[PDB]
Design a protein around this ligand. Sequence first.
Ligand SMILES: *CCC(=O)N1CC(n2cc(-c3ccncc3)c(-c3cccc(NC(=O)c4cn(C5CC5)cn4)c3)n2)C1
Length: 307
Amino acid sequence: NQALLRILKETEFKKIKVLGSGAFGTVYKGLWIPEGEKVKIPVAIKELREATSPKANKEILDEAYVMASVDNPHVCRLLGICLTSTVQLITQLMPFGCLLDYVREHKDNIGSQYLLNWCVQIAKGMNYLEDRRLVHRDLAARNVLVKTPQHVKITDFGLAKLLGAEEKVPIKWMALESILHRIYTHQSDVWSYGVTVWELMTFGSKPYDGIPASEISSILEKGERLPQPPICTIDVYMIMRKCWMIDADSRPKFRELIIEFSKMARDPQRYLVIQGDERMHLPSPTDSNFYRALMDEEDMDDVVDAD
Ligand SMILES: *CCC(=O)N1CC(n2cc(-c3ccncc3)c(-c3cccc(NC(=O)c4cn(C5CC5)cn4)c3)n2)C1
């Protein structure tokens, strides 16, 4: 559906500040000025790294129209595109930033209810991508954005597919088959999900810290995996370990991860042990209503509360 992707002209928007970057390009906070209006509307803009040609631009545009249909409350939707000598992708601006920076800044202030609800939401967004037959290829805590502390969304999915580069590097998030054979499936996205859950449970620790990328395949072949985070109980750790099994079909499915983490979120102190957890509950209905009115009016399934 062509109505889901807006083609933007360089004159109606401006990049104003750098927000960060990745393997695909630099991210900016921008301002959109609708034609004839005096308002400046904040947007997020990703400017892709490699310069592009008119032939490549037509193929990218065709793929972008399909990519703009990827609609779920836990996945950031591509809203607009500007195709000139560079490819610029426009999306809604998330003022809280990525979940990786969030868990680091609010470490020893985040409770089990939040940690477990973020795992559920990420699995929901990943299950929706699997329902759309779209392999993410770059799932990590840096690619989970915070709309509000209660609502996270996945970004940067299928960027190789958008560019027509699926058959052409975040080694520490990759399944062993992706490292060895560049094979990417919904099951290698499950391995990346286990690493992302590990990043959240360690409040943003670096996976395999100190170990060079070239040594990772050999470490995985010897059966070594990321260590049990100090807050995880054995049941949570066993789910992460199942995500990192050599046999891809032995890993859990995203629909099963939604069910297990939803069950755990219903008795959160039994699955995660955090000091001072009794005073780090989910917001009351009053606070939740206020956050939504000011920055999150979109439709979304209820957050899992404790029994
Ligand atoms: C904290 C980690 C970090 O620094 N990162 C940079 C990367 N990131 C953040 C954003 C962002 C910030 C704030 N508000 C919103 C987003 C982005 C980002 C910006 C614009 C566009 C995108 N992605 C896409 O447009 C896009 C399109 N697809 C489909 C066509 C394939 C997938 N992603 C991301 N990036 C995290």
